Amino acid sequence: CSPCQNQGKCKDEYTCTCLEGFEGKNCELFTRKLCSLDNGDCDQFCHEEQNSVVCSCARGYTLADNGKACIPTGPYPCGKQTLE
Amino acid sequence: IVGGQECKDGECPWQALLINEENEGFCGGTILSEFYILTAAHCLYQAKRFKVRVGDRNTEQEEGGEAVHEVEVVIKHNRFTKETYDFDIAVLRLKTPITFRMNVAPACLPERDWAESTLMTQKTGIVSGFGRTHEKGRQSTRLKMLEVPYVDRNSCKLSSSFIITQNMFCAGYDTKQEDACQGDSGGPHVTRFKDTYFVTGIVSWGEGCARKGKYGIYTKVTAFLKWIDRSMKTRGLP
Ligand SMILES: Cc1cc2cc(/N=C(/NC#N)N[C@H]3CCCCN(CC(=O)N4CCCC4)C3=O)ccc2o1
Ligand SMILES: [Ca+2]
Numbered sequence: 001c002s003p004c005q006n007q008g009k010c011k012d013e014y015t016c017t018c019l020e021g022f023e024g025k026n027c028e029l030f031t032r033k034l035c036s037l038d039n040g041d042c043d044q045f046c047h048e049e050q051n052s053v054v055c056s057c058a059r060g061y062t063l064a065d066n067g068k069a070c071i072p073t074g075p076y077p078c079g080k081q082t083l084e
Numbered sequence: 085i086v087g088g089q090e091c092k093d094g095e096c097p098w099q100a101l102l103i104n105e106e107n108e109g110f111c112g113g114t115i116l117s118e119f120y121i122l123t124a125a126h127c128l129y130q131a132k133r134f135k136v137r138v139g140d141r142n143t144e145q146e147e148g149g150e151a152v153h154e155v156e157v158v159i160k161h162n163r164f165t166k167e168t169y170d171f172d173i174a175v176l177r178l179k180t181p182i183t184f185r186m187n188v189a190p191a192c193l194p195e196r197d198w199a200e201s202t203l204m205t206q207k208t209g210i211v212s213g214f215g216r217t218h219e220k221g222r223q224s225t226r227l228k229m230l231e232v233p234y235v236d237r238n239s240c241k242l243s244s245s246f247i248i249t250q251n252m253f254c255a256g257y258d259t260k261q262e263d264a265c266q267g268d269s270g271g272p273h274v275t276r277f278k279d280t281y282f283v284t285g286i287v288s289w290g291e292g293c294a295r296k297g298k299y300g301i302y303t304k305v306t307a308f309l310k311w312i313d314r315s316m317k318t319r320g321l322p
Protein backbone atom coordinates (compact mmCIF):
# COMPACT_ATOMS: atom_id res chain seq x y z
CA CYS A 1 0.00 0.00 0.00
CA SER A 2 3.36 -1.86 3.62
CA PRO A 3 3.81 1.71 4.98
CA CYS A 4 1.65 1.22 8.11
CA GLN A 5 3.61 -0.54 10.85
CA ASN A 6 2.70 -3.06 13.58
CA GLN A 7 -0.25 -4.60 11.67
CA GLY A 8 -1.92 -1.20 11.11
CA LYS A 9 -4.40 -0.91 8.24
CA CYS A 10 -3.40 1.11 5.17
CA LYS A 11 -5.88 3.21 3.18
CA ASP A 12 -5.36 6.21 0.87
CA GLU A 13 -1.95 10.44 0.45
CA TYR A 14 -2.20 7.21 2.50
CA THR A 15 -3.66 6.81 6.03
CA CYS A 16 -3.06 4.28 8.80
CA THR A 17 -5.72 2.87 11.08
CA CYS A 18 -3.65 1.72 14.02
CA LEU A 19 -4.24 -1.30 16.22
CA GLU A 20 -4.87 -0.51 19.88
CA GLY A 21 -1.51 0.02 21.60
CA PHE A 22 0.04 1.89 18.65
CA GLU A 23 0.09 5.51 17.46
CA GLY A 24 1.92 7.92 15.18
CA LYS A 25 1.13 8.50 11.49
CA ASN A 26 2.36 4.97 10.67
CA CYS A 27 1.49 3.19 13.96
CA GLU A 28 5.20 3.04 14.64
CA LEU A 29 5.03 4.39 18.21
CA PHE A 30 3.89 2.33 21.24
CA THR A 31 1.18 4.07 23.26
CA ARG A 32 1.90 1.66 26.12
CA LYS A 33 4.80 3.14 28.05
CA LEU A 34 6.39 2.90 31.46
CA CYS A 35 6.91 5.90 33.79
CA SER A 36 10.29 6.79 32.25
CA LEU A 37 8.55 8.14 29.13
CA ASP A 38 6.07 11.06 29.23
CA ASN A 39 5.40 10.16 32.91
CA GLY A 40 3.47 7.13 31.55
CA ASP A 41 0.81 9.67 30.49
CA CYS A 42 -0.09 10.31 34.14
CA ASP A 43 -1.04 13.87 35.17
CA GLN A 44 0.81 13.42 38.48
CA PHE A 45 2.21 10.26 40.13
CA CYS A 46 3.26 7.24 38.08
CA HIS A 47 4.32 3.83 39.36
CA GLU A 48 4.53 0.38 37.79
CA GLU A 49 2.70 -2.79 38.75
CA GLN A 50 3.83 -5.88 36.78
CA ASN A 51 5.25 -4.09 33.69
CA SER A 52 2.18 -1.81 33.71
CA VAL A 53 1.58 1.84 34.64
CA VAL A 54 -0.69 2.88 37.50
CA CYS A 55 -1.27 6.63 37.90
CA SER A 56 -2.19 8.42 41.12
CA CYS A 57 -2.85 11.91 42.45
CA ALA A 58 -1.81 14.07 45.41
CA ARG A 59 -4.04 15.24 48.32
CA GLY A 60 -7.17 17.07 47.12
CA TYR A 61 -7.30 15.38 43.72
CA THR A 62 -9.12 12.25 42.57
CA LEU A 63 -7.96 10.03 39.73
CA ALA A 64 -10.21 10.46 36.68
CA ASP A 65 -12.11 7.50 35.23
CA ASN A 66 -9.52 7.32 32.41
CA GLY A 67 -6.96 6.43 35.11
CA LYS A 68 -4.54 9.21 34.06
CA ALA A 69 -5.98 12.67 34.87
CA CYS A 70 -6.20 14.22 38.33
CA ILE A 71 -9.43 16.01 39.27
CA PRO A 72 -9.40 18.74 41.94
CA THR A 73 -11.92 18.45 44.79
CA GLY A 74 -12.10 22.22 45.32
CA PRO A 75 -10.70 25.63 44.20
CA TYR A 76 -7.48 25.23 46.24
CA PRO A 77 -5.93 21.85 45.34
CA CYS A 78 -2.31 21.36 46.32
CA GLY A 79 0.46 22.74 44.16
CA LYS A 80 -1.53 25.19 42.06
CA GLN A 81 -0.60 28.86 42.06
CA THR A 82 -3.78 30.68 43.12
CA LEU A 83 -5.66 32.42 40.30
CA GLU A 84 -8.25 33.93 42.68
CA ILE B 85 16.67 35.37 48.84
CA VAL B 86 19.65 36.91 47.03
CA GLY B 87 18.72 37.77 43.43
CA GLY B 88 15.58 36.17 41.99
CA GLN B 89 12.40 38.27 41.99
CA GLU B 90 9.34 39.16 44.07
CA CYS B 91 6.49 36.65 44.05
CA LYS B 92 3.48 38.00 42.19
CA ASP B 93 -0.05 37.72 43.59
CA GLY B 94 -0.84 33.99 44.00
CA GLU B 95 2.55 32.80 42.78
CA CYS B 96 4.04 31.54 46.07
CA PRO B 97 0.89 30.63 48.05
CA TRP B 98 2.43 27.79 50.15
CA GLN B 99 4.95 30.09 51.78
CA ALA B 100 4.51 30.36 55.54
CA LEU B 101 6.41 32.61 57.90
CA LEU B 102 7.46 31.81 61.45
CA ILE B 103 7.09 34.95 63.58
CA ASN B 104 8.71 35.31 67.02
CA GLU B 105 7.60 37.01 70.28
CA GLU B 106 8.15 40.43 68.68
CA ASN B 107 6.06 39.36 65.67
CA GLU B 108 9.18 39.43 63.47
CA GLY B 109 9.77 36.71 60.86
CA PHE B 110 12.79 34.55 61.69
CA CYS B 111 12.34 31.48 59.47
CA GLY B 112 10.12 30.25 56.66
CA GLY B 113 7.80 27.28 56.24
CA THR B 114 5.69 25.39 53.72
CA ILE B 115 1.93 24.94 53.98
CA LEU B 116 1.11 21.23 53.58
CA SER B 117 -2.60 21.31 54.50
CA GLU B 118 -5.11 23.30 56.59
CA PHE B 119 -3.47 22.10 59.83
CA TYR B 120 0.17 21.33 58.92
CA ILE B 121 3.30 23.42 58.24
CA LEU B 122 6.66 21.99 57.14
CA THR B 123 9.76 23.76 58.48
CA ALA B 124 13.35 23.10 59.59
CA ALA B 125 14.14 21.63 63.01
CA HIS B 126 16.94 24.15 63.57
CA CYS B 127 14.45 27.05 63.37
CA LEU B 128 12.62 25.80 66.46
CA TYR B 129 15.68 26.62 68.62
CA GLN B 130 15.78 30.25 67.37
CA ALA B 131 12.73 31.74 69.12
CA LYS B 132 11.36 31.50 72.68
CA ARG B 133 7.74 31.49 71.44
CA PHE B 134 6.47 31.52 67.85
CA LYS B 135 3.39 31.59 65.60
CA VAL B 136 2.81 31.04 61.86
CA ARG B 137 1.79 33.77 59.42
CA VAL B 138 0.28 32.81 56.05
CA GLY B 139 -0.61 34.95 53.05
CA ASP B 140 1.96 37.64 53.85
CA ARG B 141 3.55 39.33 50.82
CA ASN B 142 4.87 42.52 52.40
CA THR B 143 5.75 42.62 56.10
CA GLU B 144 5.94 46.46 56.31
CA GLN B 145 2.15 46.86 55.83
CA GLU B 146 -0.92 44.97 57.07
CA GLU B 147 -2.32 44.43 53.54
CA GLY B 148 -5.20 42.27 54.80
CA GLY B 149 -5.49 38.64 53.67
CA GLU B 150 -2.72 37.70 56.12
CA ALA B 151 -3.53 35.26 58.90
CA VAL B 152 -1.67 34.28 62.05
CA HIS B 153 -2.01 30.76 63.41
CA GLU B 154 -0.94 29.45 66.79
CA VAL B 155 0.99 26.19 67.00
CA GLU B 156 -0.81 23.31 68.72
CA VAL B 157 1.93 20.63 68.39
CA VAL B 158 5.56 20.84 67.37
CA ILE B 159 6.77 17.62 65.81
CA LYS B 160 10.54 17.95 65.60
CA HIS B 161 12.33 15.02 63.95
CA ASN B 162 13.79 13.18 66.96
CA ARG B 163 16.93 12.47 64.95
CA PHE B 164 17.70 16.17 64.29
CA THR B 165 21.44 16.60 64.93
CA LYS B 166 22.68 20.06 65.93
CA GLU B 167 26.32 19.73 64.85
CA THR B 168 25.55 18.52 61.31
CA TYR B 169 21.91 19.69 60.72
CA ASP B 170 21.12 16.13 59.62
CA PHE B 171 17.37 15.42 59.93
CA ASP B 172 16.68 19.19 59.73
CA ILE B 173 12.92 18.86 59.53
CA ALA B 174 9.88 19.55 61.67
CA VAL B 175 6.12 19.61 61.19
CA LEU B 176 3.80 21.99 63.09
CA ARG B 177 0.15 21.24 63.72
CA LEU B 178 -1.85 24.48 64.06
CA LYS B 179 -4.61 25.16 66.65
CA THR B 180 -6.93 26.60 63.99
CA PRO B 181 -7.13 25.53 60.33
CA ILE B 182 -5.80 27.66 57.49
CA THR B 183 -8.49 29.17 55.26
CA PHE B 184 -7.17 28.61 51.75
CA ARG B 185 -7.58 31.75 49.68
CA MET B 186 -5.70 33.87 47.15
CA ASN B 187 -1.98 33.55 48.06
CA VAL B 188 -2.68 30.76 50.58
CA ALA B 189 -2.66 27.18 49.31
CA PRO B 190 -0.80 23.94 50.12
CA ALA B 191 2.12 22.58 48.08
CA CYS B 192 1.85 18.90 47.13
CA LEU B 193 3.76 16.18 48.90
CA PRO B 194 5.01 13.87 46.13
CA GLU B 195 5.16 10.07 46.17
CA ARG B 196 8.73 9.09 47.21
CA ASP B 197 9.86 6.89 44.27
CA TRP B 198 8.22 9.08 41.63
CA ALA B 199 9.76 12.20 43.19
CA GLU B 200 13.27 10.63 43.07
CA SER B 201 12.99 9.67 39.40
CA THR B 202 10.82 12.58 38.12
CA LEU B 203 11.41 15.63 40.33
CA MET B 204 15.01 15.28 41.56
CA THR B 205 16.08 14.64 37.92
CA GLN B 206 14.86 18.07 36.74
CA LYS B 207 17.20 20.95 35.93
CA THR B 208 15.78 23.27 38.59
CA GLY B 209 13.54 23.82 41.61
CA ILE B 210 12.21 27.05 43.14
CA VAL B 211 13.20 28.35 46.58
CA SER B 212 11.35 31.23 48.27
CA GLY B 213 11.21 33.39 51.42
CA PHE B 214 11.46 36.72 53.24
CA GLY B 215 15.17 36.24 53.99
CA ARG B 216 18.07 38.65 53.38
CA THR B 217 18.22 39.96 49.80
CA HIS B 218 21.99 40.21 50.13
CA GLU B 219 24.85 38.00 52.60
CA LYS B 220 25.67 41.50 53.94
CA GLY B 221 22.20 43.07 53.45
CA ARG B 222 18.78 43.09 55.13
CA GLN B 223 15.73 40.78 55.27
CA SER B 224 13.17 41.34 52.51
CA THR B 225 9.85 42.89 53.43
CA ARG B 226 8.57 41.24 50.24
CA LEU B 227 8.31 37.54 49.51
CA LYS B 228 10.82 36.55 46.86
CA MET B 229 11.39 33.43 44.77
CA LEU B 230 14.42 32.14 42.90
CA GLU B 231 14.90 29.32 40.41
CA VAL B 232 17.82 27.18 41.55
CA PRO B 233 19.55 24.44 39.54
CA TYR B 234 19.91 21.07 41.22
CA VAL B 235 23.58 20.26 41.83
CA ASP B 236 24.85 16.65 41.65
CA ARG B 237 25.77 15.07 44.96
CA ASN B 238 29.51 14.72 44.22
CA SER B 239 29.92 18.37 43.27
CA CYS B 240 27.80 19.18 46.35
CA LYS B 241 30.11 17.25 48.71
CA LEU B 242 33.39 18.53 47.27
CA SER B 243 32.18 22.15 47.32
CA SER B 244 31.38 21.98 51.06
CA SER B 245 33.54 22.42 54.17
CA PHE B 246 30.98 20.37 56.11
CA ILE B 247 29.38 16.91 55.80
CA ILE B 248 26.59 16.55 53.22
CA THR B 249 24.50 13.60 54.45
CA GLN B 250 22.13 11.59 52.23
CA ASN B 251 19.29 13.65 53.82
CA MET B 252 20.60 16.82 52.18
CA PHE B 253 21.08 18.08 48.63
CA CYS B 254 22.75 21.11 46.96
CA ALA B 255 20.96 23.59 44.75
CA GLY B 256 21.98 26.93 43.25
CA TYR B 257 24.89 28.45 41.36
CA ASP B 258 28.67 28.18 41.44
CA THR B 259 29.46 31.89 40.95
CA LYS B 260 26.16 33.52 39.88
CA GLN B 261 24.99 35.82 42.66
CA GLU B 262 21.66 34.14 43.42
CA ASP B 263 20.90 32.00 46.49
CA ALA B 264 18.69 31.54 49.51
CA CYS B 265 20.04 33.23 52.62
CA GLN B 266 19.54 33.81 56.35
CA GLY B 267 15.84 34.18 57.14
CA ASP B 268 14.84 31.77 54.34
CA SER B 269 15.57 28.71 56.53
CA GLY B 270 12.59 26.40 56.97
CA GLY B 271 11.05 27.68 53.72
CA PRO B 272 9.89 25.84 50.58
CA HIS B 273 11.98 24.33 47.86
CA VAL B 274 9.45 23.12 45.29
CA THR B 275 9.74 21.38 41.94
CA ARG B 276 7.22 21.92 39.18
CA PHE B 277 5.80 19.02 37.18
CA LYS B 278 3.06 19.72 34.60
CA ASP B 279 1.86 22.98 36.20
CA THR B 280 1.81 21.49 39.74
CA TYR B 281 4.32 22.26 42.46
CA PHE B 282 5.63 19.56 44.77
CA VAL B 283 7.66 19.97 47.98
CA THR B 284 11.22 18.74 47.33
CA GLY B 285 13.29 20.51 49.97
CA ILE B 286 13.48 22.65 53.09
CA VAL B 287 15.90 25.60 53.27
CA SER B 288 18.49 24.30 55.74
CA TRP B 289 21.98 25.87 55.70
CA GLY B 290 24.86 27.32 53.71
CA GLU B 291 28.30 28.87 53.97
CA GLY B 292 27.68 32.58 53.62
CA CYS B 293 24.92 33.67 50.73
CA ALA B 294 25.60 33.26 47.04
CA ARG B 295 29.30 32.69 47.85
CA LYS B 296 31.50 31.72 44.92
CA GLY B 297 32.15 27.96 45.01
CA LYS B 298 29.30 27.32 47.50
CA TYR B 299 25.70 26.16 47.14
CA GLY B 300 22.54 26.25 49.23
CA ILE B 301 21.94 23.13 51.33
CA TYR B 302 18.43 21.78 51.54
CA THR B 303 16.83 19.07 53.62
CA LYS B 304 16.00 16.27 51.18
CA VAL B 305 12.23 15.88 51.54
CA THR B 306 12.06 12.50 49.71
CA ALA B 307 13.97 10.88 52.63
CA PHE B 308 11.20 12.17 54.90
CA LEU B 309 7.93 11.65 53.05
CA LYS B 310 7.11 8.53 55.12
CA TRP B 311 7.90 10.41 58.33
CA ILE B 312 5.79 13.42 57.22
CA ASP B 313 2.81 11.12 56.42
CA ARG B 314 3.09 9.54 59.89
CA SER B 315 3.27 12.94 61.61
CA MET B 316 0.22 14.12 59.63
CA LYS B 317 -1.72 10.92 60.28
CA THR B 318 -1.91 11.80 64.00
CA ARG B 319 -4.48 14.48 63.12
CA GLY B 320 -6.09 16.37 66.01
CA LEU B 321 -6.04 15.67 69.74
CA PRO B 322 -7.84 12.50 70.98
C1 LIG C 1 19.66 27.07 50.81
C2 LIG C 1 20.31 27.95 51.83
C3 LIG C 1 21.44 28.75 51.58
C4 LIG C 1 21.64 29.37 52.88
C5 LIG C 1 22.60 30.28 53.33
C6 LIG C 1 22.54 30.72 54.66
N1 LIG C 1 23.50 31.64 55.15
C7 LIG C 1 24.13 31.45 56.33
N2 LIG C 1 25.04 32.33 56.77
C8 LIG C 1 25.36 33.33 56.16
N3 LIG C 1 25.61 34.31 55.59
N4 LIG C 1 23.84 30.38 57.07
C9 LIG C 1 24.46 30.06 58.36
C10 LIG C 1 23.77 30.83 59.48
C11 LIG C 1 24.68 30.98 60.70
C12 LIG C 1 24.88 29.65 61.43
C13 LIG C 1 25.81 28.74 60.62
N5 LIG C 1 24.98 28.02 59.63
C14 LIG C 1 24.88 26.59 59.86
C15 LIG C 1 26.08 25.85 59.30
O1 LIG C 1 26.98 26.47 58.78
N6 LIG C 1 26.08 24.52 59.40
C16 LIG C 1 27.19 23.70 58.90
C17 LIG C 1 26.67 22.27 59.02
C18 LIG C 1 25.44 22.31 59.90
C19 LIG C 1 25.00 23.77 60.02
C20 LIG C 1 24.34 28.58 58.59
O2 LIG C 1 23.68 27.91 57.81
C21 LIG C 1 21.54 30.24 55.52
C22 LIG C 1 20.59 29.33 55.07
C23 LIG C 1 20.68 28.92 53.76
O3 LIG C 1 19.82 28.02 53.10
CA1 LIG D 1 1.99 42.18 55.80
Ligand code: NA
Pocket residue numbers: 256257258259260294295296297298299
Ligand atom coordinates in the same frame (compact mmCIF):
# COMPACT_ATOMS: atom_id res chain seq x y z
NA1 NA E 1 27.53 29.83 44.81
